[PDB]
């Protein structure tokens, strides 16, 4: 439905929707912008990610509430409603994965853009894995593969303090701990990431230092919870 709106207008409206906390609208505007077929800038990639993270975040929070109620009950209503929310969550994840596959990843030549999109691919397969049962095995492997390709590029092309590299490692560690039943891998990755970033902080400006240390704090918080 966004095909008749100018690309620049979709981006401007996504920024307005963000300020208004209208994240469903924001995601629709950014899907429209992606479908214009041009590559996205760093700012635009962030708008896309913020929009869908907030949409799926609300769905995940609701699914967790309903799944907990369903587990304690073990009429059809709780299961039916959990299934409805689950289907809507899967549809949002499928939409994001479809944008990445048609055709954001293949057109991303630079490391900053390719790593960003491969991290997103890992994240949205991870959200699918949270609700999967199989099928679950295949989804987990798709998430792992995307995160690992992103890690390989990031280690070759970005410094250890780069925020995209840090956020990738953080989310891959969460995947290992919460999805893949690999808590030792999660702890090892978070520790190595934190230590390598620490040793590179001396190279950063005051503003970059604040960006990198913000994400390092999340790695530290997880390590405290996991050990």
């Amino acid at each position: 439905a966004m095909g008749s709106m100018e690309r620049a207008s979709l981006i401007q409206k996504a920024k307005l929707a963000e300020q208004a906390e209208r994240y469903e609208d924001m995601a629709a505007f950014m899907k429209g912008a992606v479908e214009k077929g041009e590559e996205l800038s760093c700012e635009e990639r962030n708008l896309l990610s913020v929009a869908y993270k907030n949409v799926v975040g609300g769905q995940r929070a609701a699914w967790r509430v309903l799944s907990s109620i369903e587990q304690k009950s073990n009429g059809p209503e709780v299961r039916e409603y959990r299934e409805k929310v689950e289907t809507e969550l899967q549809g949002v994840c499928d939409t994001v994965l479809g944008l990445l596959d048609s055709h954001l990843i293949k057109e991303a030549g630079d490391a900053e853009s390719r790593v960003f999109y491969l991290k997103m691919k890992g994240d949205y397969y991870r959200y699918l894995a949270e609700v999967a049962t199989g099928d679950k095995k295949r989804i987990i492997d798709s998430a792992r593969s995307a995160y690992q390709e992103a890690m390989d590029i990031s280690k070759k092309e970005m410094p250890p303090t780069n925020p995209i590299r840090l956020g990738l490692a953080l989310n891959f560690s969460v995947f290992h701990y919460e999805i893949a039943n690999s808590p030792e891998e999660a702890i090892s990755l978070a520790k190595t990431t934190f230590d390598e970033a620490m040793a590179d902080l001396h190279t950063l400006s005051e503003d970059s230092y604040k960006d990198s240390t913000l994400i390092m704090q999340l790695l530290r918080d997880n390590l405290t919870l996991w050990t």
Partner: peptide, 6 residues
């Protein structure tokens, strides 16, 4: 639950 990226 573990914290993921903001």
């Amino acid at each position: 639950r573990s914290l993921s990226e903001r």
